[PDB]
């Protein structure tokens, strides 16, 4: 009060000094349930895979891609994410996802990478210079290997020109290396384009089958349909906290309300366009949003020449949110004044018909 009035002698009366405000204790973020994750549970555990020249592109558009189950699993040999960090995969949205599944030899897995060249890249499947996605590969020598030679997987070896990024060729015309035209039959420079691979159960590292898939992420003029799985928190009702209900934000105490919303309405607003009620996206219950307690701090004190005792008043603040008698008045919580049942002339006006005075072993009374 001395600093507010800029004087060492404070006269008898009530003076406003500061403003009280209940600071938020913790912050909660709530989101709806995460069901029907993606067809990733079937695109990785498929029993049959296609060749490298006939790779299948599965439509992954509308499903919550759970990248945590793929990054935490310690069953992938090569896991390199280009243009994006593996940890930030569950914090960004995308438009369309495509998983190209195909089996390739182990010693030539390094050819499927941006900026790399070789024999399988420019002839079977080539990646652009810039790529926004990850690569997943795992050894499949346990089940994709039979005694006698596995001639079920083939690959395109001979081509007349380089392939474009994300290009798939179906025509299997015979290659021509010389000036003599190939009349549909093999000859000197007329060879078959497709060549079969040999997968034996006794082969060493490098020649074993490795099921490698490619994830492609693209962003165009369309609403994002695939996002990362956001995690919720616990619901704490009766305390000043920071809430986040599916994009919303603010600060207030969440008390159980009785406003029966409509089956499609999410949050409610009272007059003057203020968010006062939201629905929990998980339990579908409604609750009110009351702002946290705040108000001016007034210090009732007599003259400095009389005494140095003071009475603190929190205007419009209940006594249960303040943290030497503590008495609750209709004007606010008053601390430092003894409430008496007698009636005297109003000396220091407080409010709501209550006044304070410095009388009788000697303290401020209300």
């Amino acid at each position: 009060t001395k600093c507010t009035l800029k004087s060492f002698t404070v006269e008898k009366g009530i003076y406003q000094t500061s403003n009280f405000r209940v600071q938020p204790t913790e912050s909660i973020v709530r989101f709806p349930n995460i069901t029907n994750l993606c067809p990733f549970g079937e695109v990785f555990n498929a029993t049959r895979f296609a060749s490298v020249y006939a790779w299948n592109r599965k439509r992954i558009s509308n499903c919550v891609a759970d990248y945590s189950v793929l990054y935490n699993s310690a069953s992938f040999s090569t896991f390199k994410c280009y243009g994006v960090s593996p940890t930030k995969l569950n914090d960004l949205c995308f438009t369309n996802v495509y998983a190209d599944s195909f089996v390739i030899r182990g010693d030539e897995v390094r050819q499927i990478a941006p900026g790399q060249t070789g024999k399988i890249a420019d002839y079977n499947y080539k990646l652009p210079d810039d790529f926004t996605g990850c690569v997943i590969a795992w050894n499949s020598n346990n089940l994709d290997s039979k005694v006698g030679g596995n001639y079920n997987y083939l690959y395109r070896l001979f081509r007349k020109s380089n392939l474009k990024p994300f290009e798939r060729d179906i025509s299997t015309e015979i290659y021509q290396a010389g000036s003599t035209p190939c009349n549909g039959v093999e000859g000197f420079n007329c060879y078959f384009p497709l060549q079969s691979y040999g997968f034996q159960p006794t082969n060493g590292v490098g020649y074993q089958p490795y099921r490698v898939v490619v994830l492609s992420f693209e962003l165009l003029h369309a609403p994002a349909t695939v996002c990362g799985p956001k995690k919720s928190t616990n619901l704490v009702k009766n305390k000043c906290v920071n809430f986040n209900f599916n994009g919303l934000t603010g600060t207030g105490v969440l008390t159980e309300s009785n406003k029966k919303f409509l089956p499609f309405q999410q949050f409610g607003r009272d007059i003057a366009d203020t968010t006062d009620a939201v629905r929990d996206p998980q339990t579908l219950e409604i609750l009110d949003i009351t702002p946290c307690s705040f108000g001016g701090v007034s210090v009732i004190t007599p003259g400095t020449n009389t005494s140095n005792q003071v009475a603190v008043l929190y205007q419009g603040v209940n006594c249960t949110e303040v943290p030497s008698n503590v008495f609750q008045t209709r004007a606010g919580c008053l601390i430092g004044a003894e409430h008496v049942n007698n009636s005297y002339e109003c000396d220091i006006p407080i409010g709501a018909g209550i006044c304070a005075s410095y009388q009788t072993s000697q303290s401020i009374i209300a």
Binding site: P223, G268, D270
Partner: protein, 285 residues
């Protein structure tokens, strides 16, 4: 697959007036007796909407009407169909309606709502007729001539199967099915509402707030739509695939939206009970 429909009497288009309809919830915000005023694309009160009907009179008289033109899609449309039986079983949205661009297909084949977003090749007269036989006498839906092929599908949705009451009752109308389509930010919003009524003259008079039903993120452009009707194939009506048709008790209205200002009124529970147009009848201003 594409089969035309000949022997159809042409008539000038009819018009009616929608007194107070097309009012939908602009956003998912609960309001309890606050009388909010919003600025969005609604249907103006007492507008001039088009009336498409399908009448068929027995004998060598009457008119054979089967209305399903390619109507434009100007900033949203209002579809209200006074149906006696299940005849209107879907719509078609798009710009080119061919393999050039993509098109939205929301069609019902008597099982459930089937929504597909691909580059179809729609015919010039798509329909989903019924077949009425003498043995196993029950209205069955065996007809699909909407498009020829389907390639480059982006979005698809087929809900759980369900029965369909294709009984061709005779009498008055039973219910009204209202729909408000709008696409401003890629999302295709649909606002549906079901209200029983017992008139066969014009659009019912009253007030009913349309609630949001689905929100499909497609991102495609929509400039012209078309309504898909049903047909009846029974005895005493011989003909080829492009003839021998019959219908009746089928009518749907189409109204275009425009930027307007409305003073929506909410009750103690959050439902819109009344509204006024600020750009008409200055008593409402």
């Amino acid at each position: 697959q594409c089969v035309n429909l000949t022997t159809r009497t042409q008539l000038p288009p009819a018009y009616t007036n929608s007194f107070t309809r097309g009012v939908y919830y602009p956003d998912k915000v609960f309001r309890s007796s606050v009388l909010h005023s919003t600025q969005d694309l609604f249907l103006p009160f007492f507008s001039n909407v088009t009336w498409f009907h399908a009448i068929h009179v027995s004998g060598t008289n009457g008119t054979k009407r089967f209305d399903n033109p390619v109507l434009p899609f100007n900033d949203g449309v209002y579809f209200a169909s006074t149906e006696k039986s299940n005849i209107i079983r879907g719509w078609i949205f798009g710009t080119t309606l061919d393999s050039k661009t993509q098109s939205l297909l929301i069609v019902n084949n008597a099982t459930n709502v089937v929504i597909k977003v691909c580059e179809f090749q729609f015919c010039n007269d798509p329909f989903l007729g019924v077949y009425y036989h003498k043995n196993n006498k029950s209205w069955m839906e065996s007809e699909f001539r909407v498009y020829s092929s389907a390639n480059n599908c982006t979005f698809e949705y087929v809900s759980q199967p369900f029965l369909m009451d294709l009984e061709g009752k005779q009498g008055n109308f039973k219910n009204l099915r209202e729909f408000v389509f709008k696409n401003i930010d890629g999302y295709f919003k649909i606002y549906s509402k079901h209200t029983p009524i017992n008139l066969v003259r014009d659009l019912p008079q009253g007030f009913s707030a349309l609630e949001p039903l689905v929100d499909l993120p497609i991102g495609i452009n929509i400039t012209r739509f078309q309504t898909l009707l049903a047909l009846h194939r029974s005895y005493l009506t011989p003909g080829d695939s492009s003839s021998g048709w019959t219908a009746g008790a089928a009518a749907y209205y189409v109204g275009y939206l425009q930027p307007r200002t409305f003073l929506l009124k909410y009750n103690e529970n959050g439902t819109i009970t009344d509204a006024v147009d600020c750009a008409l009848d200055p008593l409402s201003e």
